[PDB]
Design a protein around this ligand. Structure first.
Ligand SMILES: [Mn+2]
Ligand SMILES: [Zn+2]
Ligand SMILES: [Zn+2]
Length: 210
């Protein structure tokens, strides 16, 4: 059928919880969706959630689940120039990467080490963050979800007020979310970025440096 339901079913298939997004509020159908970073949904909530998504609701994936966290980069092209095409391909070869509706890229990973606390932005370029880590108490829109930008009027908006719809798509190939040595990955981003003026944030270094 649609890619939206295929991928929603795919995340479930792999033991990850998803939550439908209300088309109007643009927020999860349930106020306390955070509980899904730690438990499933009953078989009479899952069914309900899948019908809504089939009907056309977008859906989100709570972070933190089974050590799963999403590295949320504001710009794919920026990341390509930062760590290089080879490194980006390598990463999106071992784990799941998706294109966001605003031109960014989500790299999903499994990490024993999850910042016990919220630490963002991880990296900054011009006193402005360029990547956030989505873990417990946050979520990302999943593959197949689409957003019409007609109602976006701020600056975080590339498609400000445009009658234009984009969707979360695969960077390249579908891959199971896999393990990565997170601190090592962040060390890598740091070494690649200092020559480009891309640096670790304050809290970020603190955590990293232990
Ligand atoms: Mn984001
Ligand atoms: Zn938009
Ligand atoms: Zn599989």
């Amino acid at each position: 059928s649609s890619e939206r339901i295929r991928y929603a079913k795919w995340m479930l298939e792999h033991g990850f919880n998803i939550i439908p997004i209300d088309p109007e509020s643009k927020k999860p159908v349930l106020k306390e969706w955070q509980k899904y970073s730690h438990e499933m949904p009953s078989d009479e909530e899952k069914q309900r959630f899948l019908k809504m998504i089939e009907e056309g609701y977008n859906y989100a994936i709570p972070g933190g689940q089974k050590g799963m966290v999403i590295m949320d980069f504001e710009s794919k092209e920026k990341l390509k120039a930062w760590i290089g095409e080879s490194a980006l391909e390598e990463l999106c070869r071992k784990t799941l990467c998706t294109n966001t509706v605003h031109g960014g890229i989500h790299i999903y990973v499994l990490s024993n080490d999850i910042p016990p606390h919220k630490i963002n932005p991880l990296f900054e370029e011009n006193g402005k963050g360029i990547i956030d880590l989505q873990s417990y108490n946050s979520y990302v829109l999943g593959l197949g979800s689409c957003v019409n930008h007609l109602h976006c009027t701020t600056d975080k908006c590339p498609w400000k007020e445009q009658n234009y719809t984009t969707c979360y798509t695969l960077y390249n190939e579908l891959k199971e979310i896999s393990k990565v040595d997170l601190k090592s990955l962040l060390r890598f981003l740091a070494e690649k970025g200092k020559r480009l003026g891309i640096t670790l944030s304050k809290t970020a270094k603190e955590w990293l440096e232990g």
